[PDB]
């Protein structure tokens, strides 16, 4: 019983964190094979005015780098630009490099953040990509380069490198190809993120976990078709439901079908002073896959 936002174990990723310093700037990098990836603003001269990154790279003194894994310093062989990352060839292979891939995640997908400072892991927590391409993180200056990852079958799928905080405390990274999520700019300028919409299919996975854990007070016999729901959703800060077949396993072992949960969603959009698994408002941070593993282990 129970539902907790949890991360996958972080040990295979801890071995890949390095400290990247250049000038007055210090952040984290990811050391896989013989290359270190890090946010390119580590070579930016300032962060009040706009940054010309191609110029910053042209004047780069390779020797002014300082890349270390613990007290083991890495010699820099070359530095090239990869979108909003630097790709830094170093003179040593990371013998502890795991099997790994890159994948760019979509809104509604969960992944793990290994929050790092000074090139060392400090914390690990799960996040979920919001519709405005931000995450509800906890990062302070020096956290950039912290990786986001998933682990499947012993392969580490790297999907995020931390970059910046938006005007509100939303957090933005890029993928490992160097493409900023949501197209935000790694410039210290006025940019405001769009309005976030609750990912409904995640809200449904949460309510099913709530049912599986004995929370039923919010459940109605009242029932609403997917159609009239989507009409209400777009005026009420939620997304549309498309595939309901991912809820077949949940309907099957609770006896509760989506349309009843969808109608519960509209009533709960207010909990009346009550709680659901400790929450006093709807959360879209849990995916059906997370919920399935926590209730059944598969």
């Amino acid at each position: 019983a129970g539902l907790r936002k949890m991360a996958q174990p972080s040990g295979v990723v801890e071995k890949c964190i390095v400290r990247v310093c250049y000038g007055n700037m210090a952040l984290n990098g990811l050391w896989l094979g013989d290359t270190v990836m890090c946010p390119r603003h580590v070579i930016a001269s300032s962060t009040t005015s706009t940054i010309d990154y191609d110029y910053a790279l042209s004047v780069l003194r390779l020797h002014n780098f300082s890349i270390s894994s613990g007290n083991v310093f890495l010699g820099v062989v070359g530095v090239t630009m990869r979108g909003a990352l630097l790709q830094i060839k170093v003179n040593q292979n990371n013998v502890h490099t795991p099997k790994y891939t890159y994948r760019t995640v979509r809104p509604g997908e969960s992944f793990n953040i290994l929050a790092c400072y000074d090139g060392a892991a400090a914390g690990v927590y799960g996040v979920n990509m919001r519709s405005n391409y931000t995450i509800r993180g906890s990062f302070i200056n020096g956290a950039a380069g912290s990786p986001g990852y998933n682990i499947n079958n012993g392969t580490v799928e790297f999907c995020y490198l931390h970059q910046l905080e938006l005007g509100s405390g939303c957090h933005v990274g890029s993928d490992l190809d160097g493409v900023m999520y949501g197209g935000y700019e790694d410039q210290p300028t006025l940019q405001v993120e769009g309005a976030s919409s609750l990912f409904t299919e995640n809200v449904l996975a949460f309510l099913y976990a709530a049912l599986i854990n004995g929370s039923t007070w919010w459940l109605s016999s009242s029932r609403i078709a997917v159609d009239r729901f989507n009409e209400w959703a777009v005026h009420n800060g939620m997304t549309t439901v498309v595939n309901t077949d991912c809820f077949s396993i949940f309907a099957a072992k609770t006896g509760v079908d989506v349309q009843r949960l969808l109608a519960s969603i509209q009533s709960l959009h207010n909990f009346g002073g009550k709680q659901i698994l400790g929450y006093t408002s709807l959360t879209d941070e849990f995916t059906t896959g997370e919920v399935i593993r926590q209730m059944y282990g598969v």
Partner: peptide, 5 residues
Amino acid sequence: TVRLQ
């Protein structure tokens, strides 16, 4: 205002 971290 974006903060580069």
